[PDB]
Structure 1
């Protein structure tokens, strides 16, 4: 069919997957935050 519309926005899905609490759950996720703080990013997560 016609591709390009994979993104089907849902705030509950978004926040669970890439949210603050989700990132802090695992050390591998906390190290994602730690690098982002090093670079200077405006937003560390969703």
Structure 2
């Protein structure tokens, strides 16, 4: 019956899923950081 409440915030999940260490863990994630660095993102990751 609830709508639009997909987000159930969890800091452990947020860091583990999208964190800095997670991004560096694989080459694709490292390229994610590189793209954001190129674009000049203020936040490269969570």
Answer yes or no: same fold by TM over 0.5: yes
| Cα deviation code 1:9-41 (max 9, x no counterpart) | 000000000000000000000000000000000
Gaps of 5+ in 1: none
Q: Which 5+ residue runs of structure 2 have no aligned equivalent? A: none
Question: How many residues are paired up?
Answer: 46
Quote the residue 2:30 is aligned against: 30
Runs of 4+ in 1 over 3 A off after TM superposition: none
